[PDB]
Amino acid sequence: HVSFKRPAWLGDSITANNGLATVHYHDILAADWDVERSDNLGISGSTIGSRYDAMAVRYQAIPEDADFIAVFGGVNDYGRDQPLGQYGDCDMTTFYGALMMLLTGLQTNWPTVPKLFISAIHIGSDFGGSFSAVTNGLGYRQSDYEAAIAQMTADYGVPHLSLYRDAGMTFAIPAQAAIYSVDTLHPNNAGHRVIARKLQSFLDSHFLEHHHH
Amino acid sequence: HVSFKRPAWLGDSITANNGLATVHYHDILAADWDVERSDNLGISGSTIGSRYDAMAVRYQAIPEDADFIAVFGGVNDYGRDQPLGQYGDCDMTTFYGALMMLLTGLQTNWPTVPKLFISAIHIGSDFGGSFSAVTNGLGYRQSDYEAAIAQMTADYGVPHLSLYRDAGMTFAIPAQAAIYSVDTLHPNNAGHRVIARKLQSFLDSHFL
Amino acid sequence: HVSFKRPAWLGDSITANNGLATVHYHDILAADWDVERSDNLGISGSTIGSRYDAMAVRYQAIPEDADFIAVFGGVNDYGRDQPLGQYGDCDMTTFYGALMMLLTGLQTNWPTVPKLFISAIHIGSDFGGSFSAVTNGLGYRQSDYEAAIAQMTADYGVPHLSLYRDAGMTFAIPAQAAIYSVDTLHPNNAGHRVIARKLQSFLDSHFLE
Ligand SMILES: [Mg+2]
Ligand code: NA
Ligand code: NA
């Protein structure tokens, strides 16, 4: 089974300790892995791009001896109206540009460390602002950001776990939002248990070197 | 190995216990999983769309207490000329809209139940009519219906097993249609074993 | 773990025992699998298309009794400026058409045999010629060839392992090129160890038994 001793978790409120859910996916995994330490770099509301506490800069706070790096972002870039930009952009002003710098930063400074990118579940319309099941204030769909992550991660060889495509649920359906989410955006504790299971499966199927007994 | 005790199988002829192959993929997995019950909701000729016994309506025959739901459709939508439509349709007269009605109904009524969509093998041309290895009567490739499935399932978070891209075979190639199919459309018992194998390892990959 | 007793490896300089790497990915796997034989059909500088020792023709050297077939090509097609063509092409003169020929051939002749295509790691620019981290002599990105492999394999139901996407590395990043490659094109021994792992993982999630 895949486990790590010094994981680092870069993300937004779904990763941040300050959460509406008391038990996060990484708290489940850190316990199962019996980690030496688990570095939480989640900040509520954070985007990958320039708009709010850019992950494309905050990544530089990841510990030098991290043995695993996970990035869990994009839902705020969608919901808080980060311009999407275009494939080939290389500055943090756009979502595409900010992914490029994030991905270059990670591969330059932790060349041998296993990494994955996690993108969020399809959100509902009940949170507020431009957090919609349909389009954000700039008129893009969540799946446009989700596609940007898939395209950009590919160019750097970084595996991409899409909770959007494969989590088994969408918060745009009330019956599932009621069971797995706090507010059609943030997973509750049940949603986090699901995410932990999805992440472990993904790691098992993509990272053989880091199988242990 | 992942297993389920009360699976429900929503599909067409490849699922229905009424024809050319005596042993289906879901028979193989029922035996392997030692199920309590295995609900066969296959109807021959059935489309996901409005044209024939719409699965986008028939999903409602799924038992309240199913603990796994697989949907295996699309091949009739292609071969019996269901209008494809486009992304953003919400009406069952198109394949895109029908997919939306179906996936909506699944997640509403079984929010906690593991489910997956299975896409069919690339077919050959021996069955006739619009069941062609090239294009159907509307000018679409089988792969256009495949992409529709891949796109719609993604919006709903529903894992997608593409036998089309991953089965290791195509019925458009005679050497493989002769081994694994009855007629270049329907898998034979050997084809159903392959399907069962691919499903089982997909499950192992995506479920704990 | 999924293992095979008589695998055949069709590819370029990354597969060929000509190469600058002493222990290739298939050498590692042959040793894990306890093989009866392990057929190395790598030819250095080889393309899938017509230009240099076309795999779309050479695949016929694969042994009749192969119990597994991997095709590991495309990088020379990109880097040596093989015309990409378009979806639906049929000649070996284009990349799309050569892929079609290769796939028809493999599925016709080895219908019951498990098989997969492996796509190359993102290359850097220090090798030379059109082996660029940006675009080839024809204006194409490496990912255009990678997208061709994705589409074509799918039409024949052949699983595709994209090392480009999923390897955890790119040789366009110097920090990773210095560790995992000989020259930003060819993986070194540490690079082949990583490839062996990804291949083994991919085999376990797409195949039973
Ligand atoms: Mg490209
Ligand atoms: Na899926
Ligand atoms: Na090769």
mmCIF file of C-alpha atoms in Angstrom, chain C:
data_model
loop_
_atom_site.group_PDB
_atom_site.id
_atom_site.type_symbol
_atom_site.label_atom_id
_atom_site.label_comp_id
_atom_site.label_asym_id
_atom_site.label_seq_id
_atom_site.Cartn_x
_atom_site.Cartn_y
_atom_site.Cartn_z
ATOM 1 C CA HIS C 1 1.131 -8.368 -9.981
ATOM 2 C CA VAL C 2 0.316 -8.868 -13.648
ATOM 3 C CA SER C 3 3.209 -10.591 -15.390
ATOM 4 C CA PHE C 4 3.877 -12.187 -18.743
ATOM 5 C CA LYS C 5 6.199 -14.970 -19.800
ATOM 6 C CA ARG C 6 6.956 -14.006 -23.432
ATOM 7 C CA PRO C 7 6.676 -10.210 -23.899
ATOM 8 C CA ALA C 8 7.652 -8.358 -27.088
ATOM 9 C CA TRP C 9 8.794 -4.729 -26.991
ATOM 10 C CA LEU C 10 8.527 -2.716 -30.218
ATOM 11 C CA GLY C 11 10.198 0.695 -30.049
ATOM 12 C CA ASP C 12 13.082 3.099 -30.636
ATOM 13 C CA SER C 13 16.393 3.978 -28.877
ATOM 14 C CA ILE C 14 14.649 3.833 -25.485
ATOM 15 C CA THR C 15 13.955 0.135 -26.077
ATOM 16 C CA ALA C 16 17.001 -0.787 -28.225
ATOM 17 C CA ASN C 17 20.022 -2.317 -26.474
ATOM 18 C CA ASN C 18 22.105 0.061 -28.635
ATOM 19 C CA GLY C 19 21.138 2.763 -26.116
ATOM 20 C CA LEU C 20 23.171 4.785 -23.584
ATOM 21 C CA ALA C 21 21.299 3.162 -20.683
ATOM 22 C CA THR C 22 22.649 -0.112 -19.312
ATOM 23 C CA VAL C 23 19.418 -1.325 -17.622
ATOM 24 C CA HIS C 24 16.216 -0.581 -19.590
ATOM 25 C CA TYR C 25 12.623 -0.707 -18.304
ATOM 26 C CA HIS C 26 11.975 -4.082 -20.002
ATOM 27 C CA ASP C 27 15.195 -5.541 -18.510
ATOM 28 C CA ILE C 28 13.817 -4.729 -15.072
ATOM 29 C CA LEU C 29 10.428 -6.208 -15.939
ATOM 30 C CA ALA C 30 11.793 -9.343 -17.631
ATOM 31 C CA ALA C 31 13.724 -9.978 -14.378
ATOM 32 C CA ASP C 32 10.573 -9.456 -12.218
ATOM 33 C CA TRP C 33 8.373 -11.538 -14.528
ATOM 34 C CA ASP C 34 10.759 -14.522 -14.765
ATOM 35 C CA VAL C 35 10.347 -14.617 -18.543
ATOM 36 C CA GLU C 36 10.912 -17.478 -21.021
ATOM 37 C CA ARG C 37 12.014 -14.812 -23.509
ATOM 38 C CA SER C 38 11.684 -11.043 -23.857
ATOM 39 C CA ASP C 39 11.883 -9.788 -27.365
ATOM 40 C CA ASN C 40 13.694 -6.504 -27.811
ATOM 41 C CA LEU C 41 12.613 -5.018 -31.143
ATOM 42 C CA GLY C 42 13.989 -1.553 -30.478
ATOM 43 C CA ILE C 43 15.815 0.149 -33.300
ATOM 44 C CA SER C 44 17.618 3.404 -32.576
ATOM 45 C CA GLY C 45 16.211 6.516 -34.269
ATOM 46 C CA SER C 46 13.197 4.489 -35.463
ATOM 47 C CA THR C 47 9.828 6.062 -36.303
ATOM 48 C CA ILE C 48 6.331 4.637 -36.352
ATOM 49 C CA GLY C 49 5.901 6.284 -39.760
ATOM 50 C CA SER C 50 7.727 5.758 -43.060
ATOM 51 C CA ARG C 51 10.805 7.891 -42.466
ATOM 52 C CA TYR C 52 13.168 5.649 -40.454
ATOM 53 C CA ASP C 53 12.678 1.853 -40.063
ATOM 54 C CA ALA C 54 8.888 2.178 -39.837
ATOM 55 C CA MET C 55 7.393 0.229 -36.915
ATOM 56 C CA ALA C 56 4.208 0.214 -39.002
ATOM 57 C CA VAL C 57 6.146 -2.272 -41.166
ATOM 58 C CA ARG C 58 8.564 -3.809 -38.636
ATOM 59 C CA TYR C 59 5.801 -5.037 -36.264
ATOM 60 C CA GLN C 60 5.784 -8.170 -38.423
ATOM 61 C CA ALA C 61 9.044 -9.267 -36.750
ATOM 62 C CA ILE C 62 7.037 -9.766 -33.500
ATOM 63 C CA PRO C 63 7.031 -13.507 -32.583
ATOM 64 C CA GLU C 64 3.798 -15.410 -33.329
ATOM 65 C CA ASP C 65 3.747 -16.761 -29.755
ATOM 66 C CA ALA C 66 4.122 -13.397 -27.926
ATOM 67 C CA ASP C 67 1.961 -13.294 -24.812
ATOM 68 C CA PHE C 68 2.205 -9.472 -24.465
ATOM 69 C CA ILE C 69 3.073 -6.627 -26.853
ATOM 70 C CA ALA C 70 4.175 -3.111 -25.964
ATOM 71 C CA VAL C 71 4.723 -0.417 -28.559
ATOM 72 C CA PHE C 72 6.923 2.386 -27.255
ATOM 73 C CA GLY C 73 7.230 4.929 -30.074
ATOM 74 C CA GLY C 74 6.443 8.422 -31.348
ATOM 75 C CA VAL C 75 9.336 10.449 -29.916
ATOM 76 C CA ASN C 76 11.330 10.099 -33.166
ATOM 77 C CA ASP C 77 8.241 10.902 -35.191
ATOM 78 C CA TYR C 78 8.068 14.203 -33.261
ATOM 79 C CA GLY C 79 11.802 14.919 -33.137
ATOM 80 C CA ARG C 80 12.683 13.866 -36.695
ATOM 81 C CA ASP C 81 9.748 15.701 -38.298
ATOM 82 C CA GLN C 82 7.454 12.928 -39.471
ATOM 83 C CA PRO C 83 4.313 14.588 -40.945
ATOM 84 C CA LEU C 84 1.575 14.355 -38.318
ATOM 85 C CA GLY C 85 -1.318 14.065 -40.752
ATOM 86 C CA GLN C 86 -4.923 14.031 -39.590
ATOM 87 C CA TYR C 87 -7.429 11.687 -38.030
ATOM 88 C CA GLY C 88 -8.524 9.274 -40.774
ATOM 89 C CA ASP C 89 -5.271 9.130 -42.765
ATOM 90 C CA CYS C 90 -4.115 5.768 -44.153
ATOM 91 C CA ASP C 91 -0.556 6.013 -45.464
ATOM 92 C CA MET C 92 2.626 5.406 -43.525
ATOM 93 C CA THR C 93 3.740 8.859 -44.771
ATOM 94 C CA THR C 94 1.774 10.386 -41.911
ATOM 95 C CA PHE C 95 1.849 9.659 -38.175
ATOM 96 C CA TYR C 96 -1.939 9.129 -37.976
ATOM 97 C CA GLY C 97 -1.846 6.763 -40.959
ATOM 98 C CA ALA C 98 1.143 4.777 -39.693
ATOM 99 C CA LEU C 99 -0.618 4.326 -36.325
ATOM 100 C CA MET C 100 -3.682 3.020 -38.173
ATOM 101 C CA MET C 101 -1.569 0.516 -40.121
ATOM 102 C CA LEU C 102 0.258 -0.623 -36.972
ATOM 103 C CA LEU C 103 -2.969 -1.056 -34.950
ATOM 104 C CA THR C 104 -4.814 -2.959 -37.689
ATOM 105 C CA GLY C 105 -1.742 -5.183 -38.014
ATOM 106 C CA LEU C 106 -1.428 -5.895 -34.295
ATOM 107 C CA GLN C 107 -5.104 -6.636 -33.709
ATOM 108 C CA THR C 108 -5.414 -8.748 -36.896
ATOM 109 C CA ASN C 109 -2.407 -10.949 -36.131
ATOM 110 C CA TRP C 110 -2.399 -11.108 -32.286
ATOM 111 C CA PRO C 111 -6.130 -10.912 -31.560
ATOM 112 C CA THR C 112 -6.058 -12.598 -28.134
ATOM 113 C CA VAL C 113 -2.834 -11.003 -26.892
ATOM 114 C CA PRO C 114 -2.777 -8.198 -24.291
ATOM 115 C CA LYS C 115 -1.042 -5.109 -25.642
ATOM 116 C CA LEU C 116 -0.467 -1.443 -24.952
ATOM 117 C CA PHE C 117 1.049 1.712 -26.351
ATOM 118 C CA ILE C 118 3.512 3.693 -24.274
ATOM 119 C CA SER C 119 4.015 7.409 -24.968
ATOM 120 C CA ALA C 120 7.329 9.177 -24.303
ATOM 121 C CA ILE C 121 8.258 11.589 -21.510
ATOM 122 C CA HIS C 122 8.216 15.342 -22.349
ATOM 123 C CA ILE C 123 11.621 15.937 -23.892
ATOM 124 C CA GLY C 124 14.058 18.852 -23.408
ATOM 125 C CA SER C 125 16.035 20.665 -26.135
ATOM 126 C CA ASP C 126 19.678 19.685 -25.531
ATOM 127 C CA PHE C 127 19.746 16.703 -27.880
ATOM 128 C CA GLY C 128 19.636 18.569 -31.190
ATOM 129 C CA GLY C 129 17.766 18.910 -34.488
ATOM 130 C CA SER C 130 13.995 19.176 -34.045
ATOM 131 C CA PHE C 131 14.129 17.420 -30.634
ATOM 132 C CA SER C 132 12.750 20.504 -28.929
ATOM 133 C CA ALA C 133 10.889 21.208 -25.676
ATOM 134 C CA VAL C 134 8.678 23.587 -27.665
ATOM 135 C CA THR C 135 7.957 22.478 -31.266
ATOM 136 C CA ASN C 136 9.450 20.388 -34.079
ATOM 137 C CA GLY C 137 10.677 21.502 -37.515
ATOM 138 C CA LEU C 138 7.082 21.391 -38.746
ATOM 139 C CA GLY C 139 5.505 23.583 -36.039
ATOM 140 C CA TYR C 140 3.999 20.730 -33.975
ATOM 141 C CA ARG C 141 4.187 20.216 -30.240
ATOM 142 C CA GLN C 142 5.124 16.802 -28.786
ATOM 143 C CA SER C 143 1.593 16.693 -27.328
ATOM 144 C CA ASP C 144 0.108 16.731 -30.872
ATOM 145 C CA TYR C 145 1.779 13.349 -31.499
ATOM 146 C CA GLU C 146 0.743 12.233 -28.010
ATOM 147 C CA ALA C 147 -2.867 13.235 -28.813
ATOM 148 C CA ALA C 148 -2.620 11.214 -32.068
ATOM 149 C CA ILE C 149 -1.593 8.098 -30.092
ATOM 150 C CA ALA C 150 -4.475 8.656 -27.631
ATOM 151 C CA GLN C 151 -7.101 8.881 -30.402
ATOM 152 C CA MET C 152 -5.840 6.043 -32.575
ATOM 153 C CA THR C 153 -5.278 3.527 -29.799
ATOM 154 C CA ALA C 154 -8.811 4.205 -28.583
ATOM 155 C CA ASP C 155 -10.423 3.227 -31.908
ATOM 156 C CA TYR C 156 -8.895 -0.258 -31.579
ATOM 157 C CA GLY C 157 -9.488 -0.631 -27.828
ATOM 158 C CA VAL C 158 -5.739 -0.628 -27.109
ATOM 159 C CA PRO C 159 -4.823 0.723 -23.634
ATOM 160 C CA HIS C 160 -2.493 3.728 -23.738
ATOM 161 C CA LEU C 161 0.154 4.504 -21.125
ATOM 162 C CA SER C 162 1.026 8.190 -21.368
ATOM 163 C CA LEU C 163 4.395 8.702 -19.699
ATOM 164 C CA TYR C 164 4.087 12.235 -21.017
ATOM 165 C CA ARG C 165 1.099 12.794 -18.671
ATOM 166 C CA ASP C 166 1.728 10.481 -15.766
ATOM 167 C CA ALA C 167 5.462 9.732 -15.294
ATOM 168 C CA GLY C 168 5.944 12.360 -12.598
ATOM 169 C CA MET C 169 8.562 14.129 -14.707
ATOM 170 C CA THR C 170 9.474 16.168 -17.753
ATOM 171 C CA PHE C 171 12.919 16.570 -19.315
ATOM 172 C CA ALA C 172 12.047 20.190 -20.209
ATOM 173 C CA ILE C 173 12.777 20.940 -16.536
ATOM 174 C CA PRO C 174 16.647 20.916 -16.127
ATOM 175 C CA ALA C 175 16.449 19.763 -12.482
ATOM 176 C CA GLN C 176 14.612 16.630 -13.709
ATOM 177 C CA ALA C 177 16.636 16.228 -16.876
ATOM 178 C CA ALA C 178 19.886 16.193 -14.858
ATOM 179 C CA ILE C 179 18.593 13.348 -12.660
ATOM 180 C CA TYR C 180 16.545 11.148 -14.998
ATOM 181 C CA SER C 181 17.953 11.624 -18.489
ATOM 182 C CA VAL C 182 21.217 11.169 -20.330
ATOM 183 C CA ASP C 183 20.641 14.116 -22.673
ATOM 184 C CA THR C 184 17.043 15.447 -22.109
ATOM 185 C CA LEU C 185 15.850 12.809 -24.591
ATOM 186 C CA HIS C 186 16.925 9.356 -23.400
ATOM 187 C CA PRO C 187 16.126 8.234 -19.863
ATOM 188 C CA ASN C 188 19.147 7.096 -17.897
ATOM 189 C CA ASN C 189 19.071 4.068 -15.538
ATOM 190 C CA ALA C 190 17.142 5.948 -12.797
ATOM 191 C CA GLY C 191 14.700 7.057 -15.502
ATOM 192 C CA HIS C 192 14.219 3.469 -16.709
ATOM 193 C CA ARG C 193 13.557 2.379 -13.119
ATOM 194 C CA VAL C 194 10.723 4.944 -12.976
ATOM 195 C CA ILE C 195 9.338 3.770 -16.346
ATOM 196 C CA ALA C 196 9.369 0.125 -15.127
ATOM 197 C CA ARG C 197 7.285 1.138 -12.111
ATOM 198 C CA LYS C 198 4.710 3.129 -14.086
ATOM 199 C CA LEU C 199 4.357 0.285 -16.589
ATOM 200 C CA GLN C 200 3.887 -2.229 -13.776
ATOM 201 C CA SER C 201 1.273 0.039 -12.049
ATOM 202 C CA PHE C 202 -0.592 0.621 -15.299
ATOM 203 C CA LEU C 203 -0.606 -3.143 -15.986
ATOM 204 C CA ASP C 204 -2.088 -3.860 -12.514
ATOM 205 C CA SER C 205 -4.971 -1.381 -12.963
ATOM 206 C CA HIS C 206 -5.909 -2.343 -16.522
ATOM 207 C CA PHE C 207 -5.399 -6.100 -16.447
ATOM 208 C CA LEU C 208 -6.437 -8.960 -14.176
ATOM 209 C CA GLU C 209 -4.549 -11.937 -12.777
#
